[PDB]
Amino acid sequence: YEKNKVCKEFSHLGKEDFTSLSLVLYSRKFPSGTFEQVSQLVKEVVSLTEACCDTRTSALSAKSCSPFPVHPGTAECCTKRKLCMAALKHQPQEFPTYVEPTNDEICEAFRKDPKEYANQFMWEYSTNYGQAPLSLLVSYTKSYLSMVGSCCTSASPTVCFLKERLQLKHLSLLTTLSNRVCSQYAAYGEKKSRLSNLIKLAQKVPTADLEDVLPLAEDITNILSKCCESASEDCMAKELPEHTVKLCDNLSTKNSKFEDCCQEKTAMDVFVCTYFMPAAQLPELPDVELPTNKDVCDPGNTKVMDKYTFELSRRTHLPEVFLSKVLEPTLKSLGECCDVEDSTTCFNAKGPLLKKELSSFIDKGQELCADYSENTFTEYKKKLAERLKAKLPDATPTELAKLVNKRSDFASNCCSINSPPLYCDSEIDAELKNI
Ligand SMILES: C=C1CC[C@H](O)C/C1=C/C=C1\CCC[C@]2(C)[C@@H]([C@H](C)Cc3cccc(O)c3)CC[C@@H]12
Numbered sequence: 001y002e003k004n005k006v007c008k009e010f011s012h013l014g015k016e017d018f019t020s021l022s023l024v025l026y027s028r029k030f031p032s033g034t035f036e037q038v039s040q041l042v043k044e045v046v047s048l049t050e051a052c053c054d055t056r057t058s059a060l061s062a063k064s065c066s067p068f069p070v071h072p073g074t075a076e077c078c079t080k081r082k083l084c085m086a087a088l089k090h091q092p093q094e095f096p097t098y099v100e101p102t103n104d105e106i107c108e109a110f111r112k113d114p115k116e117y118a119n120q121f122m123w124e125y126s127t128n129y130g131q132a133p134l135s136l137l138v139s140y141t142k143s144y145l146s147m148v149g150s151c152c153t154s155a156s157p158t159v160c161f162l163k164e165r166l167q168l169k170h171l172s173l174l175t176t177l178s179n180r181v182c183s184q185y186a187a188y189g190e191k192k193s194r195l196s197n198l199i200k201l202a203q204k205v206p207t208a209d210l211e212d213v214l215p216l217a218e219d220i221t222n223i224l225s226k227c228c229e230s231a232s233e234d235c236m237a238k239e240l241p242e243h244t245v246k247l248c249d250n251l252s253t254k255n256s257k258f259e260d261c262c263q264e265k266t267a268m269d270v271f272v273c274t275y276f277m278p279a280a281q282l283p284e285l286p287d288v289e290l291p292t293n294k295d296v297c298d299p300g301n302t303k304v305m306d307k308y309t310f311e312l313s314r315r316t317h318l319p320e321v322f323l324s325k326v327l328e329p330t331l332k333s334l335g336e337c338c339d340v341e342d343s344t345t346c347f348n349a350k351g352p353l354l355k356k357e358l359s360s361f362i363d364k365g366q367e368l369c370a371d372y373s374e375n376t377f378t379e380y381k382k383k384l385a386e387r388l389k390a391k392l393p394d395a396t397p398t399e400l401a402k403l404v405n406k407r408s409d410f411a412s413n414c415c416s417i418n419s420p421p422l423y424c425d426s427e428i429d430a431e432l433k434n435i
């Protein structure tokens, strides 16, 4: 099939446009790849796609061990086969740095080097938002470049940009949003992602019922598994609006913040508004015990797992990157009392262990993030230094400044409701063993 699909899109588009696609395609794959590298790999990839439309696909492998971008662990794969490389997954770029230049910078760069300007743009935009579906990336960059080409040669560039930008605002927002939401999905995988979104919703609207939010976590998860990856037909645009309707139908009346978000002029704005919403103050209800019962074994439903996750989230002041991090191992541990000779026995024993481990994790995590959510950043720094002073009596102002600096930096990246999963997974591990 595809052994003729690579060749089909080549002929249908032609070498140049097929090179623009490949540029976007590979920039997504190598988030850390430099412009020269990515462009070089593309130079040669198209090269063979033109000729062989395996014999020279091998030429690449070898040469890759270089002018080409490098995935983490390429040195290993170069041990040989040898195509251990096509198995190396890339980690998403969780810290975009893309900033659009002023109109003059764009037009000047464009008048001088039309090809290079568009290659620099496709490469930079695609490496920063590489998790948005290819179809969306390809579409926004062509519409964008079409705007640049058109406006920079118009009777009045300025007003042209004012108007064109307003008409691309939607597709622009959809692409960066998609990158974010789809990058969290790829980071966690479908199961953790689903729980993650359930946790965030529980934190945003603690007064709701599992029933009000579970359908929401389910829906977005389905939308992500269906639309994060599409080569030419984007469905994120077809799916999100109705998703905002489910969101509003279920939480519009349960929460003032949501009621307002549901007033936005577009589904994109409503969505963005509910995404940025921080974890609300938790009503702090009674504690909840681990779901140590045969009901968590249900292959057909995670009902019990979801209910626990939901109830934990709305009672525990702790960021979702923390909850998601400890829930995966914990729910998986319990799950080991399912396919055994006696489930009740394996639960009564495992119970006290997981409980203490979970509490230890929650306690240290609540310490790592103490005061961050309830205060403005500066007012947070102050209370933080104060807590550290109390714990480190012989600490010199300099040693304290380093600790406040280190801890506050960590908290600004891993205590918000939308902290970067991959980056915080590592940092959280490091910080737990701290103090
Ligand atoms: C970079 C690496 C990873 C590291 C290795 O050493 C060499 C290498 C080759 C990968 C290639 C080049 C040949 C065509 C392949 C196998 C791609 C597709 C199967 C074909 C393809 C190419 C352009 C647009 C498309 O829509 C489809 C996927 C990865 C491509």
Ligand SMILES: CCCCCCCC/C=C\CCCCCCCC(=O)O
Pocket (backbone or CB within 6 Å): 325, 326, 328, 329, 330, 332, 333, 354, 357, 358, 361, 429
């Ligand atoms: C460092 C994050 C975990 C925090 C400790 C929570 C206690 C969990 C108890 C036992 C571990 C069960 C092993 C499950 C394997 C999943 C892989 C993983 O640890 O992420």
